[PDB]
Amino acid sequence: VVVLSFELLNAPATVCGPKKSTELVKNKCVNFNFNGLTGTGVLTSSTKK
Amino acid sequence: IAIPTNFSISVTTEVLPVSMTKTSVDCNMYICGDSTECSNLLLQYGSFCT
Ligand SMILES: *[C@@H]1O[C@H](CO)[C@@H](O)[C@H](O)[C@H]1NC(C)=O
């Protein structure tokens, strides 16, 4: 018996799933996915810290 | 009997509201946003938003 325990936080990812990354596209209503954070919107360069 | 011999003139200020601010809401971007997976599910709840 193998028991796996998962933890999903705001920390950087260590164990991650196999997916083929694409090129970043800005100023366009697209569907994104960053760390399991799928959504819909436009991407714009930021100035936040 | 009592009868006045002089008088004064006063100015009184009273206030009362007339109107408020006009507001509007959009259900499809408040309840869901840009998620099309729950737009179809909100469509199954009838015509509350109308
Ligand atoms: C009535 O009141 C005004 C204001 O105080 C004053 O100027 C005037 O002299 C008064 N009238 C009399 C008859 O005293």
Residue among B31, B10, B41, B35 at smallest CA distance from A39: B35
The residue in chain A having the minimum alpha-carbon distance to the alpha carbon of residue B34 is A40
Q: Is residue A40 classed as helix, strand or coil in its secondary structure?
A: strand
Calculate the CA dihedral of residues B32, B36, B39, B44 and round it to 10 degrees. Answer: -140
CA B18 to chain centre: 11
B35 touches chain A (CB under 8 A): yes
* CA separation for the pair A41, B50 (Å, rounded): 26
User: Of B9, B43, B12, B33, nearest to A38 (Cα)?
Assistant: B33
Instruction: State whether B35 and A40 contact (CB < 8 Å).
Output: yes
Q: What is the resolution of this structure in A?
A: 3.0
Which technique was used to obtain these atomic coordinates?
Answer: cryo-EM
Q: Two tokens at B21?
A: 């601010």
Which strand (E) or helix (H) includes residue A31?
A: strand A30-32
**CB-CB contact of A33 with A13 (8 Å):** no
